[PDB]
């Protein structure tokens, strides 16, 4: 279920990942290069003026490839490319050394395959890396749409 | 699932409902009067300059009363105070005449008890009322928070 993750490439090297989630193509703003997909490379991205993120509207023909997301993040273990991610005290952590070059933009999933966060970075805390992420909290309740 | 709904009252009449959802107390802006709850009545509400809605930050001691919400709205039937609400073609509808005075601000729930919309109003379509609602779509993906 990684029809929603696309490599970003600069000088023929993977610098990071773009992710189809909800109705957006999301990519960390610091990740240099262009997305390894014709359709996505053409898009105009809007860079957040607060957060290390840029997003473009998903092409409607690729909506079925987008992953679902959720703000529901109960404490416990989550999934990513390199194995288990612990969520505890409002922080995602991994074993130090589980990380690899090019992890910026990789999503973290629950067992239903919903994206709960996107990895931007990390910092060492002893035998663990604390991931720097973007995530969705209860405050997404403010982004309402009127229907009817 | 009614610990999160509070009457709004003006000159001794219920004009509508306020709803605890996510981390917000939500109320339609058109509903006059004050919430029948001391804690909520004291709060400062921010009125949306586009939508018929105002919201205040939930008091932390009442967070356990807030309903969960979701943007996931598959087609079919949902729950509200007056019975079944059909969701179909992006519109919530009810039997004409299911509505009662003071329905502004009532939530619509799925069977897991998550709020999928808040009722603002309605218009007639034959033997049905098409509800005017606020709801959460996939575009809530843009309201990210950095953690770590």
XYZ file of C-alpha atoms in Angstrom:
296
model
C 0.000 0.000 0.000
C 2.742 2.405 -1.196
C 1.009 3.521 -4.400
C 0.886 6.828 -2.478
C 4.654 7.386 -1.940
C 6.859 8.830 -4.697
C 10.637 9.366 -4.719
C 12.047 12.875 -4.959
C 15.336 12.896 -6.905
C 18.190 15.405 -7.289
C 21.360 14.614 -9.309
C 20.044 11.014 -9.755
C 19.870 10.446 -5.953
C 16.729 9.929 -3.821
C 16.621 12.962 -1.453
C 13.217 12.123 0.108
C 9.578 11.210 -0.581
C 6.314 12.798 -1.642
C 3.106 11.363 -0.260
C -0.505 11.315 -1.566
C -2.683 11.813 1.482
C -6.271 13.041 1.655
C -6.578 15.375 -1.357
C -2.931 16.580 -1.331
C 0.472 15.681 -2.662
C 2.727 16.428 0.309
C 6.487 16.859 0.372
C 8.862 18.359 3.021
C 9.978 21.770 1.737
C 13.679 21.091 2.526
C 13.817 18.006 0.218
C 15.534 19.154 -3.013
C 14.774 17.842 -6.507
C 11.712 16.700 -8.447
C 9.185 13.963 -7.911
C 9.747 10.753 -9.884
C 6.322 11.003 -11.562
C 5.322 12.998 -14.690
C 1.884 13.945 -13.384
C 3.142 15.141 -9.982
C 6.242 16.960 -11.309
C 3.994 19.294 -13.378
C 2.019 20.495 -10.301
C 2.418 23.869 -8.617
C 3.246 23.430 -4.900
C 2.342 25.877 -2.138
C 5.025 26.149 0.567
C 3.818 26.636 4.152
C 5.169 29.903 5.628
C 5.216 28.305 9.144
C 6.005 24.571 8.533
C 8.622 22.625 6.531
C 6.048 21.395 4.030
C 4.722 22.012 0.578
C 1.540 20.692 -0.955
C -0.258 20.563 -4.280
C -3.814 19.531 -5.065
C -3.903 15.848 -6.020
C -4.748 15.221 -9.725
C -8.304 13.871 -9.751
C -7.234 10.781 -11.774
C -4.911 9.778 -8.857
C -7.417 10.285 -5.972
C -7.870 6.474 -5.659
C -4.106 6.155 -4.971
C -4.187 8.635 -2.036
C -3.868 7.163 1.446
C -6.454 7.863 4.080
C -5.274 9.774 7.160
C -6.503 10.210 10.738
C -5.984 12.436 13.759
C -6.628 9.388 16.003
C -3.212 8.462 17.437
C -3.641 6.218 20.529
C -0.339 5.408 22.279
C 1.441 2.276 21.054
C 3.203 1.085 17.903
C 2.766 2.302 14.314
C 4.241 1.198 10.961
C 6.791 2.679 8.641
C 9.268 1.553 5.968
C 11.992 0.655 8.517
C 9.631 -1.243 10.929
C 7.958 -0.189 14.214
C 7.458 3.426 15.394
C 6.487 3.957 19.021
C 4.047 6.761 19.837
C 4.225 7.831 23.462
C 4.022 11.143 25.338
C 3.009 12.872 22.073
C 6.271 11.863 20.314
C 7.100 9.235 17.665
C 10.375 7.383 18.269
C 12.387 4.628 16.564
C 15.506 2.600 17.496
C 18.578 4.769 16.818
C 20.058 3.584 13.542
C 16.703 2.348 12.100
C 16.750 5.534 9.985
C 18.358 5.597 6.506
C 19.326 8.424 4.069
C 16.282 9.862 2.248
C 13.670 9.283 5.035
C 12.250 12.837 4.820
C 8.627 12.601 3.654
C 8.081 8.937 4.589
C 4.654 8.395 6.209
C 3.829 6.545 9.392
C 0.737 4.334 9.261
C -1.636 2.625 11.682
C -2.601 -1.024 11.131
C -5.682 0.035 9.071
C -3.248 1.779 6.687
C -4.175 5.329 7.636
C -1.353 7.855 7.682
C -0.913 9.298 11.199
C 2.220 11.410 10.464
C 4.833 12.361 7.870
C 8.538 12.253 8.919
C 10.498 15.466 8.463
C 13.571 14.676 10.551
C 14.914 13.355 13.827
C 17.040 13.982 16.896
C 18.892 11.534 19.110
C 17.575 10.650 22.537
C 19.934 7.925 23.737
C 19.144 4.541 22.192
C 16.221 6.141 20.284
C 15.651 8.731 17.605
C 12.780 11.118 18.305
C 11.178 11.813 14.910
C 10.323 15.331 13.899
C 6.929 14.903 12.115
C 3.886 16.688 10.788
C 0.643 15.220 12.131
C -3.092 15.976 12.446
C -4.558 16.808 15.871
C -8.097 17.554 17.139
C -7.710 21.193 15.999
C -8.324 20.047 12.373
C -11.966 20.393 13.535
C -11.701 24.113 12.601
C -11.282 23.401 8.833
C -15.007 23.087 8.103
C -16.795 23.041 4.756
C -20.462 24.115 4.323
C -22.482 21.533 2.342
C -26.047 22.197 1.121
C -23.382 10.930 22.750
C -25.488 13.777 24.307
C -22.897 14.798 26.963
C -21.451 16.904 24.135
C -24.608 18.864 23.155
C -25.730 21.943 25.128
C -28.881 24.060 24.690
C -28.573 27.697 23.669
C -31.351 29.828 25.204
C -32.718 33.317 24.476
C -35.634 34.755 26.535
C -36.317 31.323 28.036
C -36.566 29.544 24.628
C -34.157 26.957 23.145
C -32.870 28.643 19.934
C -30.325 25.924 19.044
C -27.444 23.766 20.274
C -23.742 24.043 20.996
C -21.616 20.972 20.421
C -18.296 19.790 21.941
C -16.380 18.236 19.076
C -12.653 17.627 18.861
C -11.114 20.446 20.930
C -13.832 23.046 20.187
C -17.176 24.210 21.450
C -19.076 24.851 18.224
C -22.261 26.835 17.714
C -23.955 28.264 14.554
C -23.376 32.034 14.565
C -27.055 32.804 13.736
C -28.325 31.044 16.928
C -29.057 33.837 19.451
C -28.676 33.588 23.224
C -26.321 31.946 25.707
C -25.341 28.366 26.318
C -27.126 26.569 29.165
C -23.799 25.796 30.872
C -21.829 28.126 33.201
C -18.422 26.918 32.018
C -19.231 27.337 28.305
C -21.116 30.656 28.660
C -17.957 32.339 30.057
C -15.846 31.434 26.970
C -14.792 33.836 24.239
C -16.119 32.656 20.841
C -14.453 33.433 17.527
C -16.946 33.941 14.677
C -15.929 32.682 11.225
C -15.850 35.565 8.712
C -16.857 33.140 5.876
C -19.121 30.516 7.562
C -22.161 30.591 9.883
C -20.170 29.288 12.842
C -18.462 30.334 16.009
C -16.053 28.337 18.125
C -14.256 28.514 21.453
C -11.452 26.373 22.819
C -12.930 23.576 24.935
C -12.096 23.893 28.690
C -9.533 21.199 29.458
C -11.695 19.763 32.285
C -14.467 19.005 29.704
C -12.255 17.369 27.015
C -13.550 13.901 28.064
C -17.097 15.042 27.130
C -16.139 16.091 23.558
C -17.339 13.843 20.734
C -14.894 12.418 18.247
C -15.361 13.516 14.635
C -14.337 12.157 11.243
C -14.094 13.297 7.633
C -15.053 9.721 6.594
C -18.637 9.947 5.269
C -19.470 6.891 3.071
C -22.924 7.005 1.426
C -25.809 5.618 3.488
C -27.640 6.449 6.722
C -26.415 8.462 9.728
C -27.942 9.278 13.138
C -29.404 12.408 14.635
C -31.908 13.404 17.340
C -34.931 13.016 15.001
C -33.809 9.598 13.571
C -32.159 8.687 10.240
C -30.220 11.096 7.966
C -29.397 9.932 4.459
C -26.039 10.906 2.960
C -26.005 10.659 -0.811
C -24.514 12.706 -3.658
C -22.654 14.872 -1.119
C -25.900 15.975 0.612
C -27.534 15.054 3.935
C -31.325 14.740 3.724
C -34.205 13.893 6.072
C -37.954 13.245 5.629
C -39.701 16.629 5.310
C -41.337 17.280 8.669
C -38.678 15.365 10.688
C -37.225 18.786 11.614
C -38.314 20.659 14.768
C -37.778 24.211 16.151
C -34.254 24.677 17.567
C -32.407 22.118 15.332
C -29.553 24.508 14.432
C -26.318 23.129 15.902
C -27.495 19.511 16.266
C -24.788 17.015 15.212
C -25.126 14.079 12.866
C -23.302 10.915 13.947
C -22.137 7.626 12.440
C -22.835 4.340 14.246
C -19.444 4.552 16.065
C -20.667 7.866 17.546
C -18.364 10.117 15.542
C -19.751 13.470 14.445
C -19.824 13.719 10.636
C -21.635 17.097 10.375
C -23.339 19.899 12.294
C -26.789 21.071 11.058
C -27.129 24.776 10.293
C -30.392 24.753 8.343
C -32.441 23.160 5.592
C -34.339 23.666 2.354
C -37.215 21.679 0.898
C -36.672 19.194 -1.907
C -40.096 17.588 -2.333
C -40.802 14.944 0.311
C -37.302 15.566 1.787
C -35.418 18.385 3.473
C -31.860 18.917 2.239
C -29.839 19.913 5.321
C -27.461 22.809 5.237
C -24.453 21.519 7.284
C -20.838 22.133 8.186
C -18.672 19.053 7.693
C -15.019 17.973 7.434
C -13.609 16.890 4.048
C -10.203 15.547 2.880
C -8.831 19.124 2.732
C -8.526 19.090 6.570
C -5.218 17.352 5.674
C -3.731 20.870 5.264
C -4.163 21.754 8.994
C -0.935 20.063 10.134
C 0.905 20.347 13.438
C 4.691 19.737 13.786
C 5.479 17.363 16.700
C 9.155 16.951 17.695
